[PDB]
């Protein structure tokens, strides 16, 4: 699961497990 | 297969690690969250709100709501001092203060704080105080005319019930530690009658004022530590 | 833009405090000082209200005060012995009902909201100890049993089949076991404090045990009968992760004596049972 | 003018000509559940108006040695028309409200009620173990409780003002909703607050959602003491709505 | 080689983890798959077929079909109890159904329930029976009119056999347990007479009635678990 | 699109449950409650059909009840015993019909379907009990043999050479080995139940041991003989993937007997034979 | 070109020393040769202004001579020991309060400087000694109690339950632990040097003990009394990265005494105390 | 999972190495810096900094 | 064996082995 | 965290911490 | 050595070592 | 550090560590 941003400053947001609750620490706001 | 460097660190489980782990329940689908009224984002929402200060917590009051008043009354000795606490986030009898109580969960604070005064006796009941802060590297003042050279505000007390003194960051460094420590003392506030307790009369000699305290704008916390105004001393038993 | 964001992420500046701005004296009939606490609300005023400030660009953030962060650390909410005294079969297992109530640490920052939703990330670290000398060939199962599942009753039982249940078997000498469970309760969020009972009557329950049964963990050691005993304690590491609280509330001020509840003792000397350390008198700083 | 205040709720309208604005609990005003967070199927019953009024309760007698006093809502109103029955009757109910708390006295009186609403106000007991308070106890009605008056007994609920009647202290009460009733400026307090809750709707029987708390922090005082100063408390219910209808339930 | 942090979680064996292994056939092909009737993808499938409630579950009658017929007569006192059952999903005697089978595999069901019931008695046997709902916080029904004041049919006999009596999902939570928990108790489904059995002269003076289960549009399980319903106490053996 | 299915996988929201839409009031002639049960169908009756319901937006899902999630979960199907007491050559290997009908848990899963087609995921947790103290370097040799293929008679059968068949070798102190196995049939799929024989005469075989024959698992230490004996106690563990299931039939309800066999035992006292709980009366709740 | 920049740091090229260009002879009144200290400049001359130089072209790069690299080196900060004599509750656990001051190689190198700010590498090499023989399992926990934070007492004091600090568990046979600190000064930098004062009395403290305070180090073996005693020497070692330094200084030239102080001690053959060897006179090379 | 092969030198740890590593206090942020005169960045601006040689340093 | 979507959030689906019954769990429907 | 370059020569610059204190030695200049 | 086909469904061939006798089992034909 | 090439048979030349003696054995020629 890759979120993958280009700025080149490439970004990649990978989720390693199929279940939510798996992935980290969740960004803020 | 790919060649790879295990490196140090590996195996050991920090407390503070971020790391992606299986779930135990696959498929499984929590319940849908619904609206519930007074969600909190960030710990700095109830920094912002007042509480009050346990000012008057002598070993008498202390289990008693009077440990929240300080008492003023007529008197007979000019610019007479009312209270005196330090100014530290942590120290008492800031520390069982909401803000007092989260700064203990952080090592390191800064910012400026509101402490605020409501008057509680009569609406007959006149009087002014000059509520001032001492800057750190000298002693608390021992006059008014001494605590006046420094911050201050001076409180007329009357239709509005409330007042606000703001103790403005002035530090050295750009943090100070919560727990008490020499360099980074934050000094001194102290409470001096300006004028006097007036009443008419038939009129109570006496009227309590409740004292708050709150986080400015610019008050914040960091570095995240477990408190040491809470223990446990034995097994939490069913 | 998710990349400026990212960045934000490292130097871990998302949420910045406002800067000081350069204020002037002011004669007025504006009082910003004066206000009502009556009302129940905190008066707004700031440092350049009451003195003559200077402008100051504040560099802090507060991302670190976050709910994520002040819950996203892991604690230990359970230390699992098993001593094997005299009898392998009896010792050898055992059971613990689920709840974050045991260790005061991790409990009071809950409870310092009235409900709250999250994930749970959950790490193992056992530890044997070898009573006799040898440790021999450790492997551990420990088994999640949601409510209603059969409970094993002995070292056995054909529950530990774990036909459905799921089980997490670890080997000693490898990495500490871990992991997640998503948000388990029936309602929308956990309650941290339940005013209420699970009937009417006199004898009707009260508090958060009434709502906050997340089941049963059994463990179990999976090797059988060795020489050499030991004694294995499993201490449980509970993580909150993608968290989200409600209604805030005072901290719990006196120590903890039981589980969900907020029942607590007191002395014939109260200030030594709170924080509050006496004054000698008002102006004794 | 600021001072004055005048809410109309069904066929009430209170007034005060001395008021410290108004507190809106958690800033959210009461709502009816919306399609998106219900759970329970039937179609919810409103009585509107007939519901939605102002009762008021058993007033109480404020003197120098009152260490306080607490009502729990719903249960305040088990007995209170319309509002009552309908809370028997249905498994599910769910309201907001509107609390006005009234306690005038003189321009030479003095003295400070804190007011407050607490969600979950989970009560403790002390020195009895894991015993916890009685059904019975924490049921009190309109007449709510008297802080240190009640004989004890085992699942008496604390009566410690100073620990919040559940080991937190005091001073904190504030970051709940609340104000105060401080003489010299005005005479009463007034706040709305809406349904919170962990589920959409609950049992009205067996869960009280908020508690009313009023303490007096600084003592009533006054060179006219004969005077006897009451407190009265008028609640009124807000986008009442009740779910699961069968007989009534009787208690006890 | 690639610089690698080997995290927590590594070489455990979580029953419910889902990774991919080396097979231990490679180049195998498969038999090649058929057209079977009857394939089943879900076990919600399961849930919406009626299956007989052993409502007549005496221990006298346990271990005969009779454990599944209720038994209507003429009746000389107005509107008589005929029977009264939890609507749990899985306490007895709704347990061994195909539904509260399934539903004793999981922790969490929710969802509205569909209650039918056949009438066995001659094409000349008349009779109105009310059915009722009784939803929680109160405890059954003590009289027909008490019943009545909840959710209900009245079931007029004749032609159609069947009447279904739907119990809809009202609870506070989104969820209830499956395993009998006095917070998440569902209620209670009674039903009465409501006129009489009647029967004109050289008809059997007794009749059987049938019941069954199965699940609304709504109805839904969650959290998978070991059932409580069926137990290994000993070696299975060749 | 397959990013937006792969959201609904980390979510579980494949399968939604509908909605449940408001109703009202009605007299007609059209009476949906009345059916009959003799035709073999459901009456597809909902809770708006019966009362006035309001509308509600549902959030449940049916991904967890999925056959491939049912079926999904890795349960014990085997505990092969190694004990070493008098005599290494004939105590350090032994072999086992391979079955999915020695463990109650998983059976009576896989048994509420007449058919069922499967890729099959083998975990193997083994534990070395040190009997005298030490265990020494215990290195295991698992070996898949089909039908037809050689069964190793000694540890050092030419067999265990492994020239054509899978072996799995595991050295102590390494993680758990772990296999996949291709549905292995030689019909479309396996028979959970079969009413047929291997034959027509009075000493025909009856049942699923016709058609289910999947070989032999033959294990051994591969470690020659040591000092200091050891018990070791081979956990296999079944997780079925890619599952295809058909005609659902009613679970089991009393204990089984023996492997390939609905047979069952019946007391004197039947109600103590099957889970249904003697009911006081038909009026006791 | 970061790609270019990229190559550079591969071969260590990024800081290229000037080339020595051809000079010729001069007769001038121009003599860059002379100068005067005394205005506390460095005279700038260059070998092309004193002889006849050839054209050299130079391959030299001054990379390692940066102060990331001078500082970013790996070095023993302390020896913490858990020494099991006769009391294993007292024994197996111990604190230290953290310093850069105790190991005088790491703290000459740092004190070259007067304030330095940089992240810290902190990597554990524990050892485990068996002194009667066998070591059991050990596991072992860092705490990270930063200032205020409670210091537990025992070894099962609540505090170890680190329900906020930051702890790391190991496992022996596992690597070796690492983890990274960020800057951790209340200031924008480290003080190497304080002429400064806590105070302004006859007793107030002088020093970098006045403003460096990092908290403490709590360890202990987690794991319970064993049979066996053993010795844990856990070395800490810290490396800086992503450093900045200000305002260098003269090295350490006699022995360091104490943490936090300039002091040191002479004998009374003070050329046994510096590193000067003593000539025998002036043209003696 | 991904098919790896753990090479020699895997483990151990190199005083000079230059990995990354988790780090122990998330969220936090660090001291603003602020211009400090007289800042380092190579050893070789202290080496052309003139300082007096001991030229007679005897035993006396 | 990879199967790469694209929104951005890029999907990689795996499949690690060369053999079928090696994938894990199958998607539903 | 990836800042990829071009040149073919393509750099990964990869930070694998979400804190700026994980990465290891800085850049000179 | 990385074999990459599109079709998305992406291959990876990779071969992780410098010699042919290093790779796996040989396609077929 | 990855050279790229591309012919599809793509061809990755990773130099994981930033010193040069550290990469593998040399190309010919
Ligand atoms: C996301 O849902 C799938 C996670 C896949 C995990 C594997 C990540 C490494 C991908 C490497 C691919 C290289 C592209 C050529
Ligand atoms: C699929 O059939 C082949 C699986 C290959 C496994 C390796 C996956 C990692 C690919 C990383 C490539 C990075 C692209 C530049
Ligand atoms: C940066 O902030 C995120 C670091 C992500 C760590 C994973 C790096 C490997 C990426 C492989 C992807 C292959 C592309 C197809
Ligand atoms: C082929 O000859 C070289 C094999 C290189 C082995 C490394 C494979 C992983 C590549 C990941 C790159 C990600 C692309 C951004
Ligand atoms: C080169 O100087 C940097 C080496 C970086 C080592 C990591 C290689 C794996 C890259 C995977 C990226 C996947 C692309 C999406
Ligand atoms: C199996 C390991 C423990 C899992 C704990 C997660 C459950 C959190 C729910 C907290 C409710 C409470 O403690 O009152
Ligand atoms: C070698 C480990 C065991 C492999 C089991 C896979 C075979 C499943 C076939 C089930 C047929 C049956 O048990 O009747
Ligand atoms: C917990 C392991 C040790 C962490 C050391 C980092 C702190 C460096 C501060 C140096 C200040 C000094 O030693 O005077
Ligand atoms: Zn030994």
Redesign the pocket.
Known sequence: ??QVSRQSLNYFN???FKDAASSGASRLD | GLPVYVTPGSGQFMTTDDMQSPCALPWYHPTKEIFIPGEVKNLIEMCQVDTLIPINSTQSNIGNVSMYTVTLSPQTKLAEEIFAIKVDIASHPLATTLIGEIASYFTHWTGSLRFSFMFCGTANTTLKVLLAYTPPGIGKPRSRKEAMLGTHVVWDVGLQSTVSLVVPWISASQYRFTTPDTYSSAGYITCWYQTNFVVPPNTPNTAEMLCFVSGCKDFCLRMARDTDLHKQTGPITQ | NPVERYVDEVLNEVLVVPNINQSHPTTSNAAPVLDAAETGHTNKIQPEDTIETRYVQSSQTLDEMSVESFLGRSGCIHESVLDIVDNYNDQSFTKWNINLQEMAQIRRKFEMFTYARFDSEITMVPSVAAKDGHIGHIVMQYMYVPPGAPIPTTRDDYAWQSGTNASVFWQHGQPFPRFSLPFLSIASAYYMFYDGYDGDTYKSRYGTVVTNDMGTLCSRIVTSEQLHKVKVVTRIYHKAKHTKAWCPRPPRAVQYSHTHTTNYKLSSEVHNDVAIRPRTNLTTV | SDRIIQITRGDSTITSQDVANAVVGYGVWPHYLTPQDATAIDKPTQPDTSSNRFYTLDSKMWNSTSKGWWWKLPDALKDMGIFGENMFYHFLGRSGYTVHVQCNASKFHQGTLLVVMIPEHQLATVNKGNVNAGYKYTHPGEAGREVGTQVENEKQPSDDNWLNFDGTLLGNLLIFPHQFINLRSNNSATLIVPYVNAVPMDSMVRHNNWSLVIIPVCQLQSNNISNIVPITVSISPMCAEFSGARAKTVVQ
């Open positions: 699961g890759a990978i989720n390693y």
